[PDB]
Amino acid sequence: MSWNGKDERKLSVQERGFSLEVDGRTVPGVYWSPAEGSSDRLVLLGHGEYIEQVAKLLVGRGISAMAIDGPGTDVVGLDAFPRMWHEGGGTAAVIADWAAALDFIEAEEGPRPTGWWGLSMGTMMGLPVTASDKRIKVALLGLMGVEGVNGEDLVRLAPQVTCPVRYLLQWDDELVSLQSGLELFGKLGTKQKTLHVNPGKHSAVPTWEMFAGTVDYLDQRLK
Amino acid sequence: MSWNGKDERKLSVQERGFSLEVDGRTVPGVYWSPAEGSSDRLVLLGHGEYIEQVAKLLVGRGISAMAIDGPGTDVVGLDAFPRMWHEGGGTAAVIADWAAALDFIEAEEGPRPTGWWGLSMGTMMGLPVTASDKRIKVALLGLMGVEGVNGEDLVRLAPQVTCPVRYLLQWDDELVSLQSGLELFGKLGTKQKTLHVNPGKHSAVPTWEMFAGTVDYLDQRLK
Numbered sequence A, B: 001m002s003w004n005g006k007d008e009r010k011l012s013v014q015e016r017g018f019s020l021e022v023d024g025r026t027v028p029g030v031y032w033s034p035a036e037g038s039s040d041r042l043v044l045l046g047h048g049e050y051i052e053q054v055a056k057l058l059v060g061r062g063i064s065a066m067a068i069d070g071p072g073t074d075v076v077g078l079d080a081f082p083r084m085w086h087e088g089g090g091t092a093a094v095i096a097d098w099a100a101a102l103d104f105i106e107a108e109e110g111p112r113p114t115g116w117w118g119l120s121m122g123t124m125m126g127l128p129v130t131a132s133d134k135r136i137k138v139a140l141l142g143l144m145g146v147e148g149v150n151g152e153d154l155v156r157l158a159p160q161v162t163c164p165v166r167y168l169l170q171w172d173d174e175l176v177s178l179q180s181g182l183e184l185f186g187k188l189g190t191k192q193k194t195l196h197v198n199p200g201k202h203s204a205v206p207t208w209e210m211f212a213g214t215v216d217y218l219d220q221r222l223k
């Protein structure tokens, strides 16, 4: 667990690389925070570019963001993805890696109210992370269903997600059928869950939904 | 077509009754507007109490509201409702009555950018009205599907709804199955449609969704 690295102080958004060694694996990460001076909240960003865009907007609201790379045109739509996921340690390794990353950030920066943001592979990772780590106080999830590569893990752990959730689906998602996505949303344990569905393909979440929408939701709900 | 009636000037929200004679029927209405002094937008409120609550919030944003009574524990869940609807002239009469009501308000108050708000019977009426009257620039609809008493009319006219739409459904709605609701949302012609689904029964739309959510949506989208 150590920093490096690394980026500047002016624009207003600082960026610092870090790296972890967990259960045999080397796990690269990035931390985004305000240039000056302090930030009282944190969001973990799961992905498989839009994550840097979301991180910039969050920092603008006083919210730091952190991302590690996972077992990764969406990566989840590639024929080789299943083997990529299994060779990366699957859901167990993801849980472990994210727990170690958050431990590191809390030691270095102070424990803060923490949320999750992540779609597609970001939900393959985020739904198990939020189920497993009760430091996650709110989650934005989406673009994922029960026929995913770790569908069994998601079905098993969905009932253990007990914090507030906003879930996004795409009506015409060519990678995740609407019914498979509905089924996973249904299995989420929390009563404080809302589902937003928009027309279009997997990559076509409306930008006002992906950006303003998710950022306002986390800003309001993360306390 | 004539006013009466009638309510006051202070609180900040004025209320004026009116009455219409349309195709043989007598149609009662209400108009809500700011006490002082002018209002540049209008929303039509369809229902089968929450409508007065929504009207108050809209007026607070500078938006007038108007409601007429339709062919009406939700009325749509009563065994006698189908006969009530047919005896009231069904969808044709609803279209006619709403067109005449809006004509009246535009003559008396000036034509303004106009939206629709209405759930359940408010969507049985609102989806055909919005399809038929292109003065409707945005619609909030919900709690209704293709197995409704006028399901055939809704399926037929949904493709002709071409303005922006936010649609609400309740996951555990005992009057409208989630699949029947999904099916109707799918048939809406507009590409600028979004579906919000929340847990719970027919009467249990979260208040932040029903009030702040719908009011912010109309305020932003009605131009």
Ligand SMILES: [Zn+2]
Residues within 6 Å of the ligand: A047, A069
């Ligand atoms: Zn990346």
Ligand SMILES: [Zn+2]
Residues within 6 Å of the ligand: A073, A174, A201, A202, A203
């Ligand atoms: Zn695609």
Ligand SMILES: [Zn+2]
Residues within 6 Å of the ligand: A196, A209, A213, B194
């Ligand atoms: Zn949304």
Ligand SMILES: [Zn+2]
Residues within 6 Å of the ligand: B047, B069
């Ligand atoms: Zn009434």
Ligand SMILES: [Zn+2]
Residues within 6 Å of the ligand: B073, B174, B201, B202, B203
């Ligand atoms: Zn009920």
Ligand SMILES: [Zn+2]
Residues within 6 Å of the ligand: A194, B196, B209, B213
């Ligand atoms: Zn909503």
